[PDB]
């Protein structure tokens, strides 16, 4: 029944396994499995349990809201504007 992933933040949003790849400003997120443009230490191999996948807005480190790295050379990271659920 998890087919309905729901696009709100439940918990810290760590479990948001939606396919939103665009950030709060609608910027293109950088794939977690990529180091282009931004060389990052968020390797899905070192954080596999966090379902760190694609360029989808995820929350592995328990930030205040799911987020993503930006593909914009100037913007290292971006927040992802995801709704908030009660739980």
């Amino acid at each position: 029944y998890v087919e309905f992933s729901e696009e709100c933040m439940h918990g810290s949003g760590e479990n948001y396994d939606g396919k939103i790849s665009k950030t709060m400003s609608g910027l293109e997120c950088q794939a977690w499995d990529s180091q282009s443009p931004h060389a990052h230490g968020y390797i899905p191999s070192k954080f596999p349990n966090k379902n760190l996948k694609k360029n989808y807005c995820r929350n592995p480190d328990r930030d205040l809201r799911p987020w993503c790295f930006t593909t914009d050379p100037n913007k290292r990271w971006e927040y992802c504007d995801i709704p908030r659920c009660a739980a």
Binding site: H40, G41, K46, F47, K50, P60, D61, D63, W77
Partner: protein
């Protein structure tokens, strides 16, 4: 020791903290 505090949670926090510094640093960096 190792380039990690030997726990993913700590690395998670560190990288988060890193980015968080980056934001403040970027904010300081961006005048105009």
């Amino acid at each position: 020791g190792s380039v990690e505090k030997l726990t993913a949670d700590a690395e998670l926090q560190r990288l988060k903290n890193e980015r968080h510094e980056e934001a403040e640093l970027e904010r300081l960096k961006s005048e105009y």
